[PDB]
């Protein structure tokens, strides 16, 4: 009975939502998409939302809508999923990778500010693992230098920063991928406070069609989310508080279990926040633990326990190593070689949980 690091919280509600859409006959983008967008605006407090086929697609059209291209620079952490770096590169722009806090894995204002040049056209902070980045300082940077801030909120559905939801202001991209806090297998949504920007996003995710009877105003891609999938996301969104509460509860126990273990969890940010607990990441330093990260992951798999690696720093991956050979980001690299994600999902039981706790104890000796 293998225990994966994540399982989607699919139940009767999700099946019923699909059935309703199948029975209606309107299976691709339509009313369920509009409902999901309205729901995300209510959830976050922002004004406009555009549902898309993935958070990667959302990042692509957000950067494209800003007119990012050849010659432009986009500041981003290397400690993030490679999709953002790929989208920057594929638009013809130059990714400028900066380091992150050694204990929270989040991009610092200092590191961002040091990398700003006249060619900087966007800054993309990541709300890592469910915790929020330092938005006040980051927006301050954006305002001072006149550079748009696009938040990567893929890990942050349910995250709050100093009393306000992530996505309440500015622009933020959320994900409905299978391991995320809410899922429809694949999907995402861009929430924004700018109406002209939102209109551009809606056109770019559906062939560049717009009303000048719709016709191509400027070429765009096909990134629309089917109503079949949007209805699943809507059913999951209705359960968000319960689902995140179960994640937070399991986080607490891990925290308690870590007191008697050598593995080091991430540090919480110093600012006021609500953590979505998308991931429970531990650092496995060979010298301190007596076992390496890769060895630990393999040992756990022998015991029938899955783990995740979120993430192998983008600048250490083949394409990026060869393109940016001199790039060194010490805190990112230190963490990249030592992090791993322990099983954490809404339906996880204590049979599962202490199965993991006792597997760690075996390995710690």
Residues that bind ligand PMP (CB under 6 A): 54-56, 80-81, 83-84, 126, 152, 154-155, 175, 177, 188
Alpha helices of 68-190 — where are they, by DSSP H?
82-90, 109-115, 135-145
Q: How far is the CB of 320 from ligand PMP (least distance, A)?
A: 16
Q: How far is the CB of 294 from ligand PMP (least distance, A)?
A: 21
Q: How far is the CB of 126 from ligand PMP (least distance, A)?
A: 5
Rounded CA separation 59/49 (Å): 14
Q: How far is the CB of 361 from ligand PMP (least distance, A)?
A: 30
Adjacency order of strands within the sheet including 171-175: 48-52, 188-192, 171-175, 150-152
Q: How far is CA 249 from CA 181, 182, 254, 255, 277, in A?
A: 14, 17, 9, 10, 9
Q: How far is the CB of 82 from ligand PMP (least distance, A)?
A: 9
**Between 52 and 116, whose beta carbon lies closer to ligand PMP?**
52
Q: Which two tokens stand for residue 171?
A: 């622009």
Q: Is 180 a catalytic residue?
A: yes
CB 360 within 8 Å of CB 261:
yes
**Between 155 and 205, whose beta carbon lies closer to ligand PMP?**
155
Catalytic member of 32, 121, 180, 205? 180
**Between 81 and 206, whose beta carbon lies closer to ligand PMP?**
81
Rounded CA separation 46/193 (Å): 6
Q: How far is CA 260 from CA 249, 287, 350, 357, 364, in A?
A: 18, 17, 18, 10, 10
Rounded CA separation 284/254 (Å): 15
**Between 29 and 84, whose beta carbon lies closer to ligand PMP?**
84
Q: Which two tokens stand for residue 280?
A: 């429970």
**Between 60 and 200, whose beta carbon lies closer to ligand PMP?**
60
Rounded CA separation 265/335 (Å): 11
Active site residues: 180
């Amino acid at each position: 009975d293998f225990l994966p690091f994540s399982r989607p919280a699919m139940g009767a509600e999700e099946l019923a939502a699909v059935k309703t859409v199948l029975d209606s006959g309107w299976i691709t983008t339509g009313p369920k998409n509009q409902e999901l967008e309205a729901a995300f605006c209510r959830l976050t407090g922002n004004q406009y939302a555009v549902a898309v086929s993935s958070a990667t697609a959302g990042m692509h059209i957000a950067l494209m809508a800003l007119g990012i291209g050849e010659g432009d620079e986009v500041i981003t952490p290397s400690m993030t999923w490679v999709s953002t770096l790929n989208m920057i590169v594929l638009l013809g722009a130059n990714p400028v990778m900066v380091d992150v806090d050694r204990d929270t894995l989040m991009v610092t204002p200092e590191h961002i500010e040091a990398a700003i040049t006249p060619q900087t056209k966007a800054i993309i902070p990541v709300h890592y693992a469910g915790a929020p980045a330092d938005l006040d300082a980051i927006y301050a940077l954006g305002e001072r230098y006149g550079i748009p801030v696009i938040e990567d909120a893929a890990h942050a559905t349910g995250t709050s920063y100093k009393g306000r939801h992530i996505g309440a202001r500015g622009t933020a991209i959320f994900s409905f991928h299978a391991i995320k806090n809410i899922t429809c297998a694949e999907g995402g949504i861009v929430v924004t406070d700018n109406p002209q920007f939102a209109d551009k996003l809606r056109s770019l995710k559906f062939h560049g069609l717009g009303v000048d009877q719709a016709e191509v105003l400027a070429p765009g891609y096909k990134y629309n989310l089917p109503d079949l999938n949007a209805a699943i996301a809507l059913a999951q969104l209705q359960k968000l508080d319960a689902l995140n509460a179960r994640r937070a509860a399991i986080a607490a126990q891990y925290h308690q279990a870590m007191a008697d273990l050598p593995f080091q969890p991430l540090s919480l940010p110093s600012w006021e926040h609500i953590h979505a607990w998308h991931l429970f990441i531990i650092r496995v330093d060979e010298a301190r633990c007596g076992i390496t990260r890769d060895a630990l992951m393999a040992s756990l798999k022998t015991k029938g326990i899955g783990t995740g690696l979120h993430f192998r720093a983008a600048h250490t991956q083949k394409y990026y190593r060869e393109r940016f050979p001199t790039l060194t980001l010490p805190d990112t690299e230190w963490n990249s070689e030592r992090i791993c994600s322990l099983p954490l999902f809404p339906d996880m039981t204590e049979s599962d949980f202490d199965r993991v706790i006792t597997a760690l104890h075996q390995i710690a000796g």
